């Protein structure tokens, strides 16, 4: 299992600089 996350934590590194856009995005709105 840990074996996992260990593949996880790779993977999300690399694909940190998405989320932040996902959501807002998302929606974004704006808002406001």
Same mark, same amino acid.
């Given at each position: ?12 590194? &690399? ?12 929606? &974004?709105?704006?808002?406001?």
């Amino acid at each position: 299992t840990s074996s996992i996350v260990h593949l996880c934590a790779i993977s999300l590194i &690399r694909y940190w600089s998405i989320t932040q856009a996902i959501e807002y995005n998302l929606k &974004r709105t704006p808002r406001r």
